[PDB]
Enzyme design. Sequence first.
Site, PDB file in Angstrom:
ATOM      1  N   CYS A 199      37.197  43.359  33.557  1.00  0.00           N
ATOM      2  CA  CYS A 199      38.549  42.829  33.430  1.00  0.00           C
ATOM      3  C   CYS A 199      39.627  43.924  33.494  1.00  0.00           C
ATOM      4  O   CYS A 199      40.793  43.678  33.873  1.00  0.00           O
ATOM      5  CB  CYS A 199      38.679  41.963  32.180  1.00  0.00           C
ATOM      6  SG  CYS A 199      37.259  40.906  31.896  1.00  0.00           S
TER       7      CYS A 199
ATOM      8  N   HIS B  50      42.940  34.358  35.490  1.00  0.00           N
ATOM      9  CA  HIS B  50      42.348  35.685  35.390  1.00  0.00           C
ATOM     10  C   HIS B  50      41.540  36.014  36.653  1.00  0.00           C
ATOM     11  O   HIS B  50      40.309  35.970  36.611  1.00  0.00           O
ATOM     12  CB  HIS B  50      41.456  35.719  34.153  1.00  0.00           C
ATOM     13  CG  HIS B  50      40.808  37.038  33.894  1.00  0.00           C
ATOM     14  ND1 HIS B  50      41.409  38.244  34.188  1.00  0.00           N
ATOM     15  CD2 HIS B  50      39.624  37.339  33.315  1.00  0.00           C
ATOM     16  CE1 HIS B  50      40.619  39.233  33.812  1.00  0.00           C
ATOM     17  NE2 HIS B  50      39.527  38.709  33.287  1.00  0.00           N
TER      18      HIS B  50
ATOM     19  N   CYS C 205      40.593  43.062  26.956  1.00  0.00           N
ATOM     20  CA  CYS C 205      39.138  43.075  26.759  1.00  0.00           C
ATOM     21  C   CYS C 205      38.415  43.128  28.127  1.00  0.00           C
ATOM     22  O   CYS C 205      39.013  42.904  29.169  1.00  0.00           O
ATOM     23  CB  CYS C 205      38.678  41.873  25.895  1.00  0.00           C
ATOM     24  SG  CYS C 205      38.928  40.209  26.573  1.00  0.00           S
TER      25      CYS C 205
END
Lengths: 396, 395, 391, 397
Positions: A87, A350, A380
């Site tokens: 991420c 995302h 995260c």
Amino acid sequence: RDAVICEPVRTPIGRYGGMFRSLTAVDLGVTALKGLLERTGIAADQVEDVILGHCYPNSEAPAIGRVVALDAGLPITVPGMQVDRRCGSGLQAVIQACLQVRSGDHDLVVAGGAESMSNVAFYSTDMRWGGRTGVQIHDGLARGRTTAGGKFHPVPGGMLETAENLRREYHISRTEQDELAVRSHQRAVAAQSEGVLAEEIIPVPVRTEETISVDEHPRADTTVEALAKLKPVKQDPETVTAGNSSGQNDAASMCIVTTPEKAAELGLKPLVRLVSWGSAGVAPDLMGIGPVPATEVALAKAGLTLADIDLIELNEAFAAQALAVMREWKFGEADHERTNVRGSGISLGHPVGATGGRMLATLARELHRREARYGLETMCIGGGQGLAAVFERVQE
Amino acid sequence: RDAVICEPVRTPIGRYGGMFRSLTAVDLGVTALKGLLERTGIAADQVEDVILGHCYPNSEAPAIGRVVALDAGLPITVPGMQVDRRCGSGLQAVIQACLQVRSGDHDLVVAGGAESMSNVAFYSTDMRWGGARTGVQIHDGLARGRTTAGGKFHPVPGGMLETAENLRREYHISRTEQDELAVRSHQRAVAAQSEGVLAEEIIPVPVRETISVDEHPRADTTVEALALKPVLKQDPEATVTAGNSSGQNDAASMCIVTTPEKAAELGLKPLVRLVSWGSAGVAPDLMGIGPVPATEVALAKAGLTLADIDLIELNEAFAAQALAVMREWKFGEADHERTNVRGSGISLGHPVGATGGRMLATLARELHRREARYGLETMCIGGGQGLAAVFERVQ
Amino acid sequence: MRDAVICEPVRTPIGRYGGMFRSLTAVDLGVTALKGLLERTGIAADQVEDVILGHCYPNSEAPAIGRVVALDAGLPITVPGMQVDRRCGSGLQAVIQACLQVRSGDHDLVVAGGAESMSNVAFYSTDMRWGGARTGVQIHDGLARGRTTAGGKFHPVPGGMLETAENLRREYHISRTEAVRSHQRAVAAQSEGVLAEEIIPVPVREETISVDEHPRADTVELAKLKPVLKQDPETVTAGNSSGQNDAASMCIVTTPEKAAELGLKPLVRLVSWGSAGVAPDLMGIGPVPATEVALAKAGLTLADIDLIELNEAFAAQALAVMREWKFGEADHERTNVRGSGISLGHPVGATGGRMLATLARELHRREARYGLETMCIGGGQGLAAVFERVQ
Amino acid sequence: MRDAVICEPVRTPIGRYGGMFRSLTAVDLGVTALKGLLERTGIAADQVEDVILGHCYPNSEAPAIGRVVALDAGLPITVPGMQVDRRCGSGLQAVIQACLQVRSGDHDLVVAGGAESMSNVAFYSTDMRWGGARTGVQIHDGLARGRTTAGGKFHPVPGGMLETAENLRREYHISRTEQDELAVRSHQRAVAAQSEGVLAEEIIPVPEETISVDEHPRADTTVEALAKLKPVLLKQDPEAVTAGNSSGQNDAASMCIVTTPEKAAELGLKPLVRLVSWGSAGVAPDLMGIGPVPATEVALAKAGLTLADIDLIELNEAFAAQALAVMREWKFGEADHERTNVRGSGISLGHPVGATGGRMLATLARELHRREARYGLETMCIGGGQGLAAVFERVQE
């Protein structure tokens, strides 16, 4: 010397199986890179590296930054590459860019990322020597959510399962999760009509042939009671749904990384400088929490406190997880005034490799609008990592 | 401040479908990282990053450096990641390691790379929305990667192999010379084995017995018995063969990147410091030439000349290509005394993501043995790139 | 050698490839249809001695599909079953085999039918077992790939049955002007209510469907459509050929003795049948040598036949068979009266059963005597049966 | 009616799964064997009125396989062909269908047989067409997957025919010693039949070298040697069949001519047998191995005969436990093994599914002609719970 972020852009963000389904990871990265080269009017042979975060690579596009560079115009002299720190890749790209600029090695590079979740490959490791064993085909999205912490730390239910583990530990209510979720959507629709998203977004052409410049996921009609209807994704009687987590998404982001000297030389407008960054490892099963040790390390290096930060971009992978980071930071209702103001992961999505660059786009542009000084970008990272960068505004 | 390379190691290199076929990219990377942590006796929570170049990644092992780190022992606090700049990835890993050490950001990191070419996925982009309209294709990740690296505007059907045919054409290099360079690679590889010097580079790997000898180097390698069918019918004068190019391979490499302060604090033995590096882009159809503009940029920054370099590691992706880079550098027969002394890609193989770390292993260790001062590591990169690093010995 | 009689010939509705029945397997359709037959006839399940199904794209989902269909539909563990493949003629092949084993005295009652889910035909590879390191890995679409291998190595036909239906237009000089009749007869047979006796309604999760998907009431001008030509300047389109389809057919095959014993109503008896091989590249023509052999054995002439079911695989092909039989405009009064392949579709393994349904039931309505069922078969074959009405 | 007669019943050698015939397709095999039949009988090709083949793992490589094999082997565009599937009984299904269409007066001469390339059975998916977005994508091995679906939803059998052959050992209390004793007999009769030279008349040699010897039979097969093998499902069952006492997976094809004595005389053919009768049956899927029992009754009943009138028996040895269980039911004593599978069977030779039927017919008809005995039985169990039996009678000339 300083490293400065110019013209941070991104495509609109599309849903998995949505408006950008016909377009590849390269397609998106290409549009976005042409969009950046157009707005800044840079000479192409000025780019000394294209460094892209990209989380589901394959042989369609090896060393993806080089491919995006060629496919977008740039000359045969421009190098490029691919980075994966899940991420956090988009920010990993940025940090790497900053490092190789600040060392004096390069004067200007492109940092960004590209994700076509819609188009991630199905793959097998059984077809080469033959299938004693049978043949399995893994979905690159499903399979990636279970392998990120290795053999010693498996997590069958993915990042979704890790975001249940945070709700359990920090005792966070379903009401509150959805209450954050409504804020995200409202700030995303409000940022659209306010017209501020038009500076962030490179419009993308697609065939039916039309142009798209509006994010697909943000809904104006989202409300609290509507959300409370949804089914928590059986194993646990007690809170994460497709409504209070970020989905799977298509998009790309680009931005120029350079010195103030060179920015002035090419008519560029620096929005921020990299003050500091931190990386951290936490438990895979508790990955959501990653921003905490990382935000400490980045604040520590900047000699700064969480309360000196005028703006925060914390990725809302899952609302439970966002709030859990917010528990640790001792966040009260007044702190939501300075956190994900143009929205975040739950409303926008995302698109893994591009998220970093999107957050940077919104951080550096809202910080220039409010005329505030300091910004924090953190997220995260599947498999149990967290990454944070502290940015400071630039004046003339 | 300085960045220093300590205990640069690597697994043995296996053939595609050879001794390491049973083992994953992770498996190799894990053995090698354990082997590094065992020889240096470092405390595991000291490693602030595991940065691995890795060229055929998939969802078996996302952000591979983190995966390798957990699977090898290290605590949940050690971050990790994956890099891809094709053949240059190993060195990319090292340069990134050096950058984030020199900036003051980290005191100690692991740089390396892992490649299981034996276990590269087959994949499809047709199985998700279904193949009614279109049919379903399945690509071999190895084959398909050798054709897409230059993008739409620069396709190269025959891979890096075809680009190594373009260099022989341009720089008029004979088949004889190719295979003669190939024999030197092999002889230096077998000689480096029996000289026992490879034992310091290699972490032995267990496999469902223990192996510590490279699989590809043959002592019986001969000029005549080679003078084999040129892979690429399309060209009468075609010269490149499975014998005068590097094959497809399995292996991993690790090394510690740190400061002299911290290396002293943990009893470490710095072998070199990164003086400089350069990257370049060339024509995809001419990729093999990448070392040239890259070596200029790295020498330029070091304020040095090609002749001040006591040792050179140039990856022998294809013998034609290695000689083409050697034409440009105005190399005479005397220059082969300082170039790929412990062998290179043709004899040892090219396990893509690990190659960088292997060259660094042989550069830093032979430079400490000969008591010479300067080293160069450079390689061509599929899709038309070159990367170079200049290394200096430590006292 | 006593008589073999056809009782309660039924079929599902016919769905388009990717249409209403997409959610349902080959088995699903077979099952419904067999339940629908056992329900209308009220037979005791242990009375069926064989379930024999034509089925053209089999796979390991359902081996010996007739057995599978029998179990999955209720019938006891004592009922045997199997699968047959003679491409387009499989449904009729199943019937002929059923008649043969009844007439020999071996069985008193059997089920004959066929089942095709063209929507769910497997994608398959022959490269994934020993590995694709030398060779790469190919994946065939079981529909596409079947249209090119039916004639074997010595007679390949890249463009499939479509290409063979061009070869007939070329040879017999048949005009594009010369499909609407099929459609009108199909919509007209629907509203006349006659199709309700042929069709077993199918539940899809959950509404029930009993109307065929492909027939449209709405014309000649149609002539718009693009001939599937780039290779050939001169006429086959998705409009004048039969498409790819989902469906199943069932029927009971038995003796008049046993039919009387269980309260059954024989509609026809199998007089005769013939099989033939023609050129793969000229497959469409199959009904000709086959119809001769079946007429010859029945000691009958083409003009004694009161009703004809000729499968309209492709309109060009159907007319080419009609050239051979010396057909004038008056002959279309006795040919595919409730429609055919172009309007209804061609769910390969089920087609045979469908034509038998329409043949046996229209013959009983018109009170006429003789029927002919015949069809071309991919790879160059032709099958015909001659049927005679009962009581 | 009139009689149906079996002429020149031939077969390829039987190869192991992943053995000598791995490079060859089901078609390849079917083609050699058909050419070998046409060559030994010297028939005019346009005389064949049907090629009917049993074939258990068909795919779009070869649709209506009998037509394909016919064209690929030489025969004219006028010969029709097809494919049958009744699992293990398909080779015999093909023959029975041949006999039926000959005896009705419909055809004078047809080819019946079967072809199986177990080595080249497709891997397939039903998820790739509309996409695996929701569901993921599965790829089934056509061999593994077929051993679990044959009894449908209401009767699943996870361990395949292997699991059913254990249910029989359990029910009929059959010892491991006995299983492996049968298994040695099979092998000894198979190696003995080879050196006796009698297999040369059954076998069409396959082509670069030529091969005419079956791959699986071993002369060195021992009772003690075999007792040292691991029962495939010992893990789920303490008392549990091995790769040594069951038939494996195999490559092969079989062909034979079905015709009338009139037409056989007209073409210089030598009828070996006539089909007296046949029966089919359905049993429990979980007890499939027992199928020969109700089927053998029906066939004997129709022939008005008794199990003791049969001079020779071909019972397929799918699994030794299963073969013996059928032998329990038939009240078999040690003396009965003198008239059962004399040239061997499934355990020594292999079980190339679609071709088995034709092979047993080859051995039945030829040994019956050598011993100058009168009646023969061919019966086998069938995956999914079926059994098929045919009673054959020698022809005297």
